[PDB]
Amino acid sequence: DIADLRALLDEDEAEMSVVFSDPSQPDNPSIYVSDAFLVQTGYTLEEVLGRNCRFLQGPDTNPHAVEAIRQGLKAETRFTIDILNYRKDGSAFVNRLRIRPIYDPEGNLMFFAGAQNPVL
Amino acid sequence: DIADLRALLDEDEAEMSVVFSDPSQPDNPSIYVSDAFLVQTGYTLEEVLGRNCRFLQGPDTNPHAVEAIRQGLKAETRFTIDILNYRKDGSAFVNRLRIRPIYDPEGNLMFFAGAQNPVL
Ligand SMILES: Cc1cc2nc3c(=O)[nH]c(=O)nc-3n(C[C@H](O)[C@H](O)[C@H](O)COP(=O)(O)O)c2cc1C
Ligand SMILES: Cc1cc2nc3c(=O)[nH]c(=O)nc-3n(C[C@H](O)[C@H](O)[C@H](O)COP(=O)(O)O)c2cc1C
């Protein structure tokens, strides 16, 4: 039996590119990625599940934006950042990335939710 | 924001005593316990959340039934066992315990769900 991770999505996220990660696993890997994510990025589920989402970054991604995300995750707070991301075919797009922490009833950090929106 | 763990309950479990545990944490602690569980066992949420459910066992609990549960968990399969359990006030009851594993989209074990039913 498989956990319905999508039952933890916000209303805005249902038709969105969204990723859930497990920060209690080494390197905070994705444990769920929506079909919209896979469509936008050009990957199959097998290519990305269980990997840290940094594979979306590429040669012109700003390293300070990457460090900003890393510190935002450590802060365990809601944040949004515009970051240059890349599809499997090498094409680049500005990604408005919104991340929020999700806690268990004890109050321990449980998951991160990250929603991607191409900036048009 | 808090994960709706109860959104992973089976239909029969909603008005039941149920526990979810996190086997990736040391000693497989409870991360969710229903109000029906707390009512039947006589505990407050603070007294039991984050503890392994073996606190339900007591002086006349059969140690082979305990070992059976331990092996069933290692097997990652659905199982049910009748085991003598105890409330905080020391009173004892026969517990028909049903446990099932819950996996993530990758297929890795994610949670255990355990439902308690007093045998009448
Ligand atoms: C749920 C989640 C979703 C993420 N989505 C993206 C994303 O869409 N694009 C991106 O560049 N980084 C994303 N990240 C950030 C990377 O996974 C990583 O945290 C970032 O590169 C900083 O960590 P690092 O310095 O170890 O690489 C996401 C992180 C999480 C936890
Ligand atoms: C989700 C879950 C619910 C459990 N519920 C009970 C229970 O109601 N009564 C009980 O005696 N053991 C219950 N257990 C079993 C104990 O937590 C523990 O696994 C058992 O005592 C065997 O492990 P041990 O030999 O380390 O004690 C439950 C275990 C899990 C994972």
Percent of residues in β-strands of chain A = 25-35%
Oligomer: homodimer
Question: Helix/strand-derived class of chain A?
Answer: alpha+beta
Main beta sheet of chain A: 5 strands, antiparallel
> What is the molecular shape of chain A?
globular
Q: How many DSSP E strands of chain A? A: 5
| Small molecules held by this entry | flavin mononucleotide
Radius of gyration of chain A: 14 Å
CATH class of chain A: Alpha Beta
Largest interface: A-B, 24 and 24 residues
CATH topology heading of chain A: Beta-Lactamase
What does this entry show, briefly?
The PDB classes it as signaling protein. Chain A is an alpha+beta fold and 120 residues long.
Keywords:
alpha+beta, Beta-Lactamase, 5-stranded antiparallel β-sheet, 3 helices, globular, PAS-assoc_C (chains A, B), Putative blue-light photoreceptor (chains A, B), FMN (chains A, B)
Describe the structure.
With 120 residues, chain A is α+β, with helices and mostly antiparallel strands. Chain A has a single domain, classed as PAS domain (Beta-Lactamase). Helix content of chain A is 20%, strand content 32%. Chain A contains three helices and five strands. Chain A has a five-stranded antiparallel sheet. In chain A, a hairpin with an 8-residue loop joins strand 1 and strand 2 (30-33). One flavin mononucleotide binds next to strand 1, helix 3, strand 3, strand 4 and strand 5 of chain B.
Q: Topology of this structure?
A:
Two copies of one chain form a homodimer.
Chain A: E1 17-21, E2 30-33, H1 35-41, H2 45-48, H3 63-75, E3 79-86, E4 92-103, E5 109-118
PDB class: signaling protein
Keywords: PAS, signaling protein
Assembly: dimeric
